[PDB]
Amino acid sequence: PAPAWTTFRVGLFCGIFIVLNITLVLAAVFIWPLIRIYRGGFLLIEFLFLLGINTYGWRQAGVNHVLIFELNPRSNLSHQHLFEIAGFLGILWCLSLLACFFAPISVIPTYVYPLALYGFMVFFLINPTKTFYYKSRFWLLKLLFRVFTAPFHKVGFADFWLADQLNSLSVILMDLEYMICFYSLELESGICHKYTYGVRAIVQCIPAWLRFIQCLRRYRDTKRAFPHLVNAGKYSTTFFMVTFAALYSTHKERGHSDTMVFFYLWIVFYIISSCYTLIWDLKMDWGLFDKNAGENTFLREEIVYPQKAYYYCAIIEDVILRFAWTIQISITSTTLLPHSGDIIATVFAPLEVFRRFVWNFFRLENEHLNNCGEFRA
Template sequence: MVTQDLEGGDRQRAMKRLRVPPLGEQQSPWTTFKVGLFSGSFIVLLIAVVLSGIFHRSRDDWRIVFRLYRGPLLIIEFLFLMGINVYGWRSSGVNHVLIFELDPRNHLSEQHIMELAAIFGVVWALSVLSFLYSASLSIPPYVNPLALITIMAVFILNPTKTFRHEARFWALKVLGRIILAPLFYVNFADFWLADQLNSLVVVFVDFQYFICFYLTNDNWMAADDINVCVDYTQIIRPLVGCLPAWWRFAQCLRRYRDTKEAFPHLVNAGKYATSFLVMLFSTMNVIYTDAYRVTTENPYFYLWVMASILSSCYAYTWDIKMDWGLFDKKAGDNKYLREEVVYSSTGYYYFAIVEDFILRFGWALNLSLTTMGYVHSDIMISILSPLEVF
C-alpha cells in the first residue's frame, strides 16, 4: 500500500524514499534505566510465578486461570515485540515515522514501548502471585484478574493528558477506524494494526470469556463450573474470534471501492474470507461432536481440516509473495528473496520463511496432540498463541 500510494507501485523508488540513514535518536538515560529495572523485575517475578505454579497446590480451576491471565500476557508480549520492531526499523533506516504518519517531534521510541510492556509485565506477575497465594493474603483469588484488567484499561483509556496521552489516543483512534471498517478510508497504520490483531485472536476470545466469567460467577473465592462460559457461548465465541479477520476483510473491500483495483484488494479479501470458513466448520464440528461415536465420523471435522489447509496455504503464499515480496525472479544475489532488502543479514528473511510456514500450519500439531489426548487444548493454545504473536 505504501509503495502504491507513494510511488505508483514502483517498489525501488518507494524503498529509496522510505529508507533513511540509521536514525540515531537520542535515548533518555532515565528511560533506559527504567526499562532495565522493570524488565529485570519482570524476569525475576516470572521465574517466581513458574516455580510457584509448579510447586503450589494444584487447582481444579487451572483452565479458568489460564484463560483469565493469558490474554493480558499476550498483549504485554505484543507491546514488547513492537518495541523491538521499532528498534529494528530505526537501526535499518526504515522511516516508520513517515509510514505511520506520526508526529516527528512527539512519538514513542522503542524504549518507551518496552518500558510500558515491562511495567505491565510486573503488574501481571504480581497479580498471578497474589492469585496463587490468595489464601495466605486473605484476598478472594478472583479479585486479582479483575484488578489487573482494570489497571491496564484505566491506563490505556485515561482521558487526562498524562502517561503518553498523544500516543495512547493515536492508537485508540486507529483502533476505532479499524472497528468501524469499512466506513473510513484505510491508512497504512489502520491495516497494519488490523493485521497484527489477526495474531491476537486468542486475546479477543479470552476477553469474551473474561466478561462472561465475571457476569455469571458471583463467587470470587472459587469457580467450580469451568465450562459454563464455553457451553453457553458456543456461537458468540467464534463470532468474536472472527472479528479481526472481518475487520481486514472489510478494509480490503473499502480499498477496492476507493481504488477500483480487484488485485490485490479483492484477492486479499479472499484470504480473510477463508478464516470465516475455518471458524464455521470448527464450530459445527464442536456442536455435533456428541452426535458421532468418534471424531472421524463427523463430516464437519473433514470440512474443518480442508478449510484450515486452504486458509494456511492461501495466507502463507500471500505472506511470502505479496506482503514480503520474496521469491522475486529479479532477486540477483539475494537468492529466493527480493532485489531490495532492508535488513543487512539475509538470514532474517530465510528464518522468516521457515518460521511463518511452521506457524501457519501449527494448527495441525495442535489438532494431532489434543485429539490423541497427549496435551490439553488450553495448554497447546497457551504454547502456540505467543508464537503466533511472535
C-alpha cells in the same frame, strides 16, 4: 537518544520483572481458570516487547516506519519507551499472579487481582490526564476506533497493520468471551468449554471480519480487484475454517451423519486458509521471491536488512507458525481436542505473536522499499 532516566526505568522494570518471574516459577514448582485469564495480559506484554524490538530494528535498518505509519516526525515514541511500558505491565501482571497464588489477604478474594490488573490496563490506555504517553495513547485509541469502524473509514496503513495485529491477538478476545461464559454459567460446571456455540466462532472471526471489510472498502475506493478482493478471499478462508470446525464439533456432540463431511470440509478449508495466508505474507506483504532478484535467491533484489539468513529463517518460521496459527484458531473456536485444546492454544499464542513480530519487520521493510500496500500516492 532516549532519556537517561528512561533507560534507568527500563532497566529497573526489566530486573524486577525477571525476579518476579523467577519467584512465580518457584511458587509454581514449590476456583478460577488463571491460565486463560492471564494469557491475554502475557500476550499483550510480549507484543509490546516485540513492538519495541520492531521499532529498534526499523530505526537501525533505515526503514522509514514513521512515514509509513504517518507518525509525527517531531515527536516519535522510542523503543525504550515501549520496553518501559512492557516492563511495568509485566511487573503488575506478575504481582497479580503472585497475589492469586498466595492469597496474601484473606479479606481480599482472588478474582479482584486479575480484575484490578485488567482495569488498570484499560484506565492507563484511556487515561484522560496528559501524564504518561498521552499523545501516543490518544493516537492508538483513534486508530483502534477507526479499525473497528472499518467500512465507515478509509483504510490506511496504520489501520490495516493494527487489524493484522488484532488477527494475531484474537486469543485475548477468545479468553475474554470464555471468562464471560464462565462467570455466567460456571460461577454443568464445565459447560462453557464442554460445548461450543456460534457466538464463540463470531468472536474468533471478529479480527478477520474487520480485515475482510477493510479489504472490501479498499476495493471499492481504488476499484482494483486483484490487490484487494484476493486478500478478502484470504480472510474469508478463516471464516470458512471456523464455521466448518464449529459444525463438525456440533455434529460430534450429536451425530446427524454429517460429522464426517464437516470434518473433511474443515480439513480442506484449513489447508486452504493456511496456504492462502502463507502465500500472501510470503509474496504480497513481504515481496520476496521476486523475479527481478538475481543476487538474492528466493528474496527481492533490494534487501535492506543485512543478512539473507534472516529472510530464510523468517520464511521457514512463517510457514510453520502460519500452519500452527490456523490450527490454534480451529482449536480455540471449537471444542475439537477438549483436554489439550487450552494447552495447545497457550503454547501457540506466543508463537503467533512472534510470527506477527517478524512479519511486521519484513512487511514494513518491503513497504519502505516498495509501495506494496498502495496506501501512499
